Amino acid sequence: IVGGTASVRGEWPWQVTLHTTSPTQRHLCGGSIIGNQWILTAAHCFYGVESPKILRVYSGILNQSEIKEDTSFFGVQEIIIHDQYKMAESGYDIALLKLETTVNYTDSQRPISLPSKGDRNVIYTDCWVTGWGYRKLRDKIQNTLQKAKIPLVTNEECQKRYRGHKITHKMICAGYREGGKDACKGDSGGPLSCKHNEVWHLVGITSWGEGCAQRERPGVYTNVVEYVDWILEKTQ
Ligand SMILES: CC(C)(C#N)c1cc(COc2ccccc2CC(=O)O)cc(-c2ccc3c(c2)[C@H](N)CO3)c1
């Protein structure tokens, strides 16, 4: 996250850190708890991943330094990538991880609801992007989970900033005209969480963009509401 601030314990309890364990253990991407055995994340995170065997999902983490040799984590039973996925910029950048066991919900780990059925006309004005990603180019994964409030921009405006790409209604964009706040490497797969009537909803999945926090280059997110039929079918 560029231009964000440190989160505190229990602030974003649906946020998880997905680690790969070979050839080193490192944070790969973010994700969101959406059910007791289900993480919603970005398909592009799994490029070159030979199987779910090398993944670990950590929930209830604020600082990456908390993760030690005895820190509990969930194994991944299955990676479900959208059948239309090809590359992040084309869309369909969405994946489910089915965990090997259930997540017990606490103040530090609990699910986020998807955008509600019937809320098409809701205008989201309080959206936040979170993660352990870079705070600038050529950075490293951050220790403390960062947060930034980012305004949604219309798909029409987003398309004008990305004339070389097809911005579809399966994507949503968010960013400031002058840049300064955005997601960056290591944030993909995590949530774009929006609060409406004091309830958080998972409106976007961090997916792609040109650089990080550049002026007139908003972040592009998977528009979760357009995948509810797919999510529900896979998690039923
Ligand atoms: C820093 C650099 C090189 C630039 N520009 C760069 C590299 C990568 C590559 O990351 C991965 C590759 C394979 C697998 C997994 C990842 C990790 C990942 O996607 O988070 C990603 C982003 C980036 C991520 C999110 C984002 C934006 C850019 C937009 N600002 C809006 O949201 C930027």
From Swiss-Prot:
Gene behind the chain: F11
Whole-protein residues included: 388 to 623 of 625
Transmembrane intervals: none
Bridged cysteine pairs (disulfide): C29-C45, C127-C194, C158-C173, C184-C212
Peptidase S1 domain mapped to chain residues: 1-236
Glycosylated residue positions: N63, N104
Effect of G31V: In FA11D; mutant is not secreted by transfected fibroblasts; dominant-negative effect
Domain of life of the native organism: Eukaryota
Active site: H44, D93, S188
Protein name stated in the entry: Coagulation factor XIa light chain
Binding site for heparin: K160, R161, Y162, R163
